[PDB]
Amino acid sequence: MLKYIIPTMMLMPLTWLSKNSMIWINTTLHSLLISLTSLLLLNQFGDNSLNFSLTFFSDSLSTPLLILTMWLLPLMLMASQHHLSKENLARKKLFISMLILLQLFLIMTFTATELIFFYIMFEATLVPTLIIITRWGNQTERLNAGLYFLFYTLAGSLPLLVALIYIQNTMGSLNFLILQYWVQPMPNSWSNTFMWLACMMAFMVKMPLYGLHLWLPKAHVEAPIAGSMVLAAILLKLGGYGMMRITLLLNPITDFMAYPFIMLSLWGMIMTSSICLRQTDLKSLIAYSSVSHMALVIVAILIQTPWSYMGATALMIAHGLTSSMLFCLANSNYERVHSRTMILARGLQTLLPLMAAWWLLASLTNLALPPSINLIGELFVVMSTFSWSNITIILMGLNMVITALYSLYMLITTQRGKHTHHINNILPSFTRENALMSLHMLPLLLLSLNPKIILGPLY
Amino acid sequence: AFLPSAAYLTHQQKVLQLYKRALRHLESRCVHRDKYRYFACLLRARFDEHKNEKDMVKATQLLREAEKEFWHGQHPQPYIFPESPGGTSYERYECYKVPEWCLDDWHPSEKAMYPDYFAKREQWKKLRRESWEREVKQLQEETPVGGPRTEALPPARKQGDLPPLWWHIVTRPRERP
């Protein structure tokens, strides 16, 4: 995996040694080259995981997340180079360096063979996101956004640190490949109960679980665009990745300890979708939609059937692309009206038709329109939960109803109706903005043609 | 109750509005033209019977129970004009009503498609930018202390000056763009 870590680290002399007008072009170009190279991780096998070294491996779960991570960096560079156009040159290079350092921590978070190195990288990803939110954020409450970001993600991860070292002292190793073959059945006891909670609540915060989700509609709202993109596309998915690694060790105590968290996620996907139906803030609507879609991923990990894990990894990749595109659309209108109020500027198809087409595509992929991989993930999680309990189809279908409702209400409110009379700075769509929308949507549309690469280790 | 020029409806205005609503809901009940015309002159005679009622309290009482009679005898789906609010073609063409400022954001390779039009748009915007400060100082030399009283706008009184706050009334989009 070192052949991607070293070009990611060479992006730092590539961004600090550039000409002052060339720092976006060079970083965009070479991060696109690294993302071109990221497809060499697709050397997967039906029996064996692609085990590089003692430190790194990449099975079919980490591989689409790595391609998505290495693809998201040029899109963040394109998205952030307008609102930072009046920034200091040194602060601009520091922003680019925080994005590169975050990519560096992510691409060896997903390839961590050993779980405490996963923990070190998994908590190292906070600090660039911390600096991005609480340096280049927008309004006054960006410091309360990162404070509840840093507190929730560390108070959940702190019992995880004791839990992984307890596995280290008892089993002998935190290699995932070793613990595939040395896993013991975890019985029913109170010690094993708090063991399960310590191993799970960190990723429950990072997904987020309903009830633990209150950091997210402030950390996504008060972030700049690259921060919101990476938060909704990768940093939520670190929790699903960690759960799919850690529920190997938590059997069969999961089969009766997962019930209250299955109830929390199955009801919070209804609650947060209803909350999306009544958001005045567009970026908050996309944030609560992200919570509502990750609740299904929590359910599919906690019921641990093969169809559930396939649907959960498909839904993580699909939702990463879709929510990144929706935040970029919301920023494209925030760069014109300077407000995130959704009811402020309406009728924008009368002024921006092609951007309204990108809004339509992102809304249709939001509500899981077939044959997108959004619907593949949504549908497989619904199949596995119907197998889990037949009564859960009511909550699943009701969630899908409310999902289509808030998706098309966002489409109607932002794009349709009568336009606003007292707003006259609505520029034509730049080539950069449509390039950003197309580089989101076209990979998402192409992954419907060959969906098997994003269906995880047990396709 | 809710009007742009004044704050209230007078008694005579409420009489005329009940007369018009009664005839429209009657025509909704009475589809054919001749049968409507028969019952419409019957209803007109019912209005004109108490036309000369000098007591304002008795006139208000007859108007109030006439509103009650009308509320009982209204049509459930009255005929709404199509471009009227509630009609079938109401606000249908608003998706074609692009405002006028979007012409200024055209590329010059498509502003050269209409040279006379934008060569005239420049002198329209010239007329607006040399009328603006004079009509603002017209507004602040006529508004009473404590703000304006009604929403009614004053006209231009001099020659050479344009009426104040005129741009989004003169340059509004057409009903068929």
Partner: peptide, 13 residues
Amino acid sequence: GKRLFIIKPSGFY
């Protein structure tokens, strides 16, 4: 004849 100019946003970009 009597053709009317149609105000539409910038279709160049």
